[PDB]
Structures are given as structure tokens and as C-alpha cells.
Amino acid sequence: VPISPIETVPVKLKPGMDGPKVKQWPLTEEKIKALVEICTEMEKEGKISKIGPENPYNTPVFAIKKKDSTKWRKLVDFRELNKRTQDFWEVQLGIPHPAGLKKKKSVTVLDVGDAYFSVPLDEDFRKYTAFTIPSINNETPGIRYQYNVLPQGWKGSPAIFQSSMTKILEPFAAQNPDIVIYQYMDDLYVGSDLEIGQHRTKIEELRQHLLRWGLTTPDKKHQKEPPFLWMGYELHPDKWTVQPIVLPEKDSWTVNDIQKLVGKLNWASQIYPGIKVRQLSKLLRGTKALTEVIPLTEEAELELAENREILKEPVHGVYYDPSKDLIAEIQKQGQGQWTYQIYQEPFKNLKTGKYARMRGAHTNDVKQLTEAVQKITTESIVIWGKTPKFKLPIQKETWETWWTEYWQATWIPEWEFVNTPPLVKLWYQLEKEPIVGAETFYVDGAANRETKLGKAGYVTNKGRQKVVPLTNTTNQKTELQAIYLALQDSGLEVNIVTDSQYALGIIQAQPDKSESELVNQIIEQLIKKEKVYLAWVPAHKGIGGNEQV
């Protein structure tokens, strides 16, 4: 019976709310007897206390049998009390990433038993946790209890436990600056560079401290020894990797199965380089029906095959050495997919990852590269608390040319060029000034929103003019189509004039790829030209405009 002299954390109900009141009659004698057997022992240990029924509050009680029926477990549903309890500080958002851990000569894992019941509950609040064990029929007075300690499933339990643990660890860490303690949920992880004998002595010492405060640690074995299967990882003394990834074989796939698959792939991507989720996640654009059986496209099949080839043999990440420089390297996968590795030494990775651009209809390689650099910078600041040096497949002149003329402010930290094809380049550049000795194409196109017919055409200063009909199109498509016609029918140098702000918008963005075939063809033409000057004029003001519809 380890009662604790731990200072309690003051707790309030949400303002204007009172304690929960719910009557529990049901159900059967057996459950009642089990509840008695449990509650007597809990009362004996001081975890709960029988109370006089003076205008109290109540909460439902259940008894649920685990596998191997030799033991029973009591389940109290506190949701209705959780509604009325005050908010607490967030407990733990993320877990620490293994790539950010430092190598230690010794690492010990400590599991604390009955953690919540070892930590007392604020006195004035205790009455709100009251519950009743039912009589065997015949409306006889039920057994009243209340919690003296943190109830399992109660809103404030994990946070209060965390702070209690921190305070308990406070005096030990003061006498032991040479060791590192990470606290996670009900577990403690103690690293040290102390010699194994000294380390084990210190661990036993810590165990004794914790036991003095009413917290238990394993006396059989000491149990966990590397691995160390933790939060989907495998932690080894000199290395870390993911737990084994298994990709199921199926003749049929639903949205759920694809979700799980893509999840496993994403998880696998942090270490195994080259993982591609694009074609497989594109099948998930079916966000309407979640139970719908989804047929696999050929692209998705090939991609999954590639991932299976990558996952064939194991790969491992290393740990972080603060004394060494931090390097990040990026490669383009070509489909709008990007992959990267973060490392210190050449044959070892701290971790890997991927960036994909789902955003936008049109984009280009340089901007995507910048976004990747951004993602990696954020991730690095989170994990190691610093920004990595970058190795990038881009010439400095390319980058400079892009950012100097770009409308958005962008910046990249210290980085150097690495030559590993494909290189990131500017595939075309529009002239800043009109070209002397070039045919001028006044272009335009229009569509009927109803009939979806539309057309596109041009007229040139040399008197040449063309008009082509279109079907199943839109005004935007007709404007782009007009520009494309002008490109097709012109020479190596061309001046185009458009009244479409949209088309000029797409072209001035300098995209190297798009999901639209038209824009792709326009891009090809633009690459094939020596000089292209695109100019814009107000529509319908009839300046130089096209009079034909």
C-alpha cells in the first residue's frame, strides 16, 4: 500500500457546470460481486473511499472481462464528468524522432505500474468522481465510493501525472546531471555514458527513489533490452530503423485498404529512400465514397511494385552527433515528387523523406525545390534545433535568375550545387521587350458557356489570319488555344498580343509542367522558340482587338 505525499494539483469544473449525476441500476449479481472484490482492495490501498450519501454526484460503473478469465477489470465511464471538467495543458503532441537522439553507452526503459492510482487527486474535487455499486435487486442502499487518486480515463489524469513525475524526478536529476531522462506517458527512458556498473547502480538508485515516492519499476529482469520496439520503430544501440513493413497482396482494394497502404508507405519513407505515394494517393481523390472498391490503375501498380522493390532489403538510420555538420540533399523524382536524405557521414543517413506538391494546377521545378527546402528546414528545426546545409541540383545562376524576377519573396540558407541529373533549370524565358523583325500575332478566343462550342484565332500584322473551331471547351481553354495557335504558326521569334489576363497569368508563371495537355504543348512550343514576347491589352476597348467572334 504505497500512498503518496505528492502535492496535489488544484482542479476546477468548467464555469457554470456542476458535477455529473447518473443513476446506475444494472445489471447482474456476478458483476456486483466482482466490483465488491475489487473496490474493497482499492479501498484498502487508499485509492478509493466509501462516502456518506449526502447529496452526492454519480457515475456509471461497468465490469469487463479480459482474455484469460482468471482476473476481472472494472471500467468506469467518465465522459460525462470529462465534459464538465476544466481544460488542462496539452499533454504531448509529438514523440521525439530517433534521428534526433544522441548515442549513449547505456539506455534503460522503466515501466511504472498503476501510474495514475499512485498520484493523489485534489481533495475538494474528489466528490465529483463518486460512483455507486448496485444492490441485488430489492432497492437496498448502494455502495458509495469516491476516488482519492487520479481515475483512469479522467480528462486531467495524464497531464497531472506528467507534472507529478517531473517534480518527483527534479531532486534526482539535481544529484545526477550526467544522465538523461526522457519521460513519455507511463514510461521513462534513461540514457547515460556512465560505465555499465555505475549506470546500473544509478538505475537501481533511481528505482529506489521512485519507490520512495510510491512508483514501481520492474524487479523481475529489468525486462526491456534492445530492441526496443517503440512507437513503430526499432531502436538499436548503434542504429535505428522502422518496425517491419508488410504490404498485403490483394485482388481487390477498397478506400480503407488504400488508406492503410499509403499510411504504411508514408511511415516507411522517413528511412527507405525513393518511396513514391503519388499514383497510389491519386486513387484517393475518390474522397466521396469511403467504402467504395477502387480498381488499381497501371501507374499505381507500377509504383507499388517499385515500393516493393525498395522495401525488399532493410535499411537503417543512425543517431545524431552534435559535434558534426548537418547536411541535407535533395533529388527530383520527376512526377512532382521529390525525395531527400538528411545526413552527417556519407554512407549513413539520419533520416530521409519526401515532398510532393498537391497544391496548384501549374508549377515549376524551382519553386517546388524552394518549397522542399522549406519543409526540410522546418523539420530540421523541430528535430535537431538547427537548419541543415543544403546540397542542391541547381546552378546558382539559375536560382538567382529565378528569385530576382519572382514576384514572391523567397530565400534559401547556405547551399551548394551538386551535379546529379536531372538538374533543375529554366526551360524558357520570355523577352522583357518586344522583338524587332518579328511577326506580331494578335490572338483571341471565346466560348459559349452553354453550348460549350467556342473557337480560337489570330490576325497578324503581315495580314495573315487563322480561325479554328473547338468543342467541349471554356473561355480559358480558348485563350490558351489561341496563344498555342500563334505559337504553332509563327517563326523562331514571335510577338503575341492577348487580351486574356488568365492566359498571360499562366504563361508568366513559367511552369515547366501541368496536368493540362494544352499547357504542356504550349510549353513545348515555348521551349522550341528562340524569342517569345507576350504582351497584354485591355479587352473590349477595341484598341487593337479582334472584331470577329
Partner 1 sequence: PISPIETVPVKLKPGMDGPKVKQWPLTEEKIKALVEICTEMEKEGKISKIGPENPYNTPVFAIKKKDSTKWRKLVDFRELNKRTQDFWEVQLGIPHPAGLKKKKSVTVLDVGDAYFSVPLDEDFRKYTAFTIPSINNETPGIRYQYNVLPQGWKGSPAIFQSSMTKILEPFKKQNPDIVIYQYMDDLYVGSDLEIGQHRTKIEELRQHLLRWGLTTPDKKHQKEPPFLWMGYELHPDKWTVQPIVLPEKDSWTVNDIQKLVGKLNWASQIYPGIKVRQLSKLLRGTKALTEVIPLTEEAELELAENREILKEPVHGVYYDPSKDLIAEIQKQGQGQWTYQIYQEPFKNLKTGKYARMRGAHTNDVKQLTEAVQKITTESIVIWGKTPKFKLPIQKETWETWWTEYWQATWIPEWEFVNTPPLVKLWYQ
Q: Which of 55, 407, 419, 517: binder of partner 1 (CB under 8 A)? A: 407
Give residue for cell 524487479: 219
| Residue 337: Cβ-neighbour burial (10 angstroms; 0-12, 13-18, 19+) | buried
Q: Which range touches partner 1 (CB under 8 A), out of 26-34, 107-115, 258-266, 530-538?
A: 530-538
Q: Residues marked as binding for Mg(2+)?
A: 111, 186-187, 444, 479, 499
From the list partner 1, ligand 506, none, pick the one residue 488 interacts with, judged by a Cβ distance below 5 to 8 Å according to partner type: none
Listed residue (78, 231, 220) closest to 158, CA to CA: 78
Q: Alpha helices, DSSP H only, in 296-390?
A: 298-310, 365-384
C-alpha to C-alpha distance for 390 and 373, rounded to whole angstroms: 8
Nearer to ligand 506, 230 or 417 (CB): 230
Contact 61, 76 (CB under 8 A): yes
Minimum CB distance to partner 1, residue 487 (Å): 16
Contact 371, 360 (CB under 8 A): no
Minimum CB distance to partner 1, residue 209 (Å): 19
CA of 141: how far to CAs of 22, 30, 131, 207, 235, in Å? 16, 18, 13, 44, 54
Q: Which of 237, 274, 336, 545: binder of ligand 506 (CB under 6 A)? A: 237
Q: Which range touches ligand 506 (CB under 6 A), out of 16-24, 223-231, 493-501, 535-543?
A: 223-231
Minimum CB distance to ligand 506, residue 162 (Å): 16
C-alpha to C-alpha distance for 510 and 365, rounded to whole angstroms: 10
**Segment 134-163, which members bind partner 1 (CB under 8 A)?**
156, 159-160, 162-163
Verify binding: residue 172, ligand 506, rule CB under 6 A.
no
**Segment 292-351, which members bind ligand 506 (CB under 6 A)?**
319
Verify binding: residue 388, ligand 506, rule CB under 6 A.
no
Nearer to partner 1, 300 or 394 (CB): 394
Q: Which set of grid coordinates corresponds to residue 477?
A: 481553354
Q: Which of 62, 230, 253, 428: binder of ligand 506 (CB under 6 A)? A: 230
Verify binding: residue 513, ligand 506, rule CB under 6 A.
no
How many other β-carbons are positioned within 10 Å of the β-carbon of residue 213?
19
How many other β-carbons are positioned within 10 Å of the β-carbon of residue 139?
8
State the DSSP H helix or E strand holding residue 43, giving kind and residue range, or none if neither. helix 29-44
Contact 511, 363 (CB under 8 A): yes
Q: Which set of grid coordinates corresponds to residue 95?
A: 514523440
DSSP 309: H
Verify binding: residue 107, ligand 506, rule CB under 6 A.
yes
C-beta nearest to ligand 506: residue: 191
From the list partner 1, ligand 506, none, pick the one residue 474 interacts with, judged by a Cβ distance below 5 to 8 Å according to partner type: none
Q: Which of 196, 302, 361, 382: binder of partner 1 (CB under 8 A)? A: 382
Q: Which range touches partner 1 (CB under 8 A), out of 31-39, 86-94, 247-255, 419-427?
A: 86-94
Verify binding: residue 224, ligand 506, rule CB under 6 A.
yes
Contact 481, 518 (CB under 8 A): yes
Q: Residues marked as binding?
A: 111, 186-187, 444, 479, 499
> Which residues sit opposite 110 in a β-bridge?
188
Q: Which range touches partner 1 (CB under 8 A), out of 40-48, 211-219, 226-234, 373-381?
A: 373-381
Q: Which of 2, 46, 56, 100: binder of partner 1 (CB under 8 A)? A: 100
Minimum CB distance to partner 1, residue 468 (Å): 19
Q: Which range touches ligand 506 (CB under 6 A), out of 85-93, 224-232, 466-474, 509-517?
A: 224-232
How many other β-carbons are positioned within 10 Å of the β-carbon of residue 546?
20
Minimum CB distance to partner 1, residue 500 (Å): 11
What are 165-172's contacts with CB under 8 Å, separation 24+?
165/215, 167/6, 167/7, 168/6, 168/209, 168/210, 168/213, 168/215, 171/209, 172/206, 172/209
**Segment 453-512, which members bind partner 1 (CB under 8 A)?**
459-461, 495, 497, 501, 504-505, 508
Contact 296, 76 (CB under 8 A): no
Contact 204, 218 (CB under 8 A): no
From the list partner 1, ligand 506, none, pick the one residue 172 interacts with, judged by a Cβ distance below 5 to 8 Å according to partner type: none
Dihedral sign (CA 511, 513, 515, 518): positive
Q: Which range touches partner 1 (CB under 8 A), out of 24-32, 221-229, 420-428, 528-536?
A: 528-536
Listed residue (191, 162, 163) closest to 176, CA to CA: 191
Verify binding: residue 383, partner 1, rule CB under 8 A.
yes
- Build a one-symbol-per-residue string for 409-448: x at contacts with partner 1 by CB under 8 A, - elsewhere: xxx---------------------xxxxxx-x-x------
Residue 169 CA, chain-centre distance (Å), reads: 31
List interacting residues with ligand 506 (CB under 6 A).
96, 101-104, 107, 109, 180, 182, 189, 191, 224, 226, 228, 230, 235, 237, 319
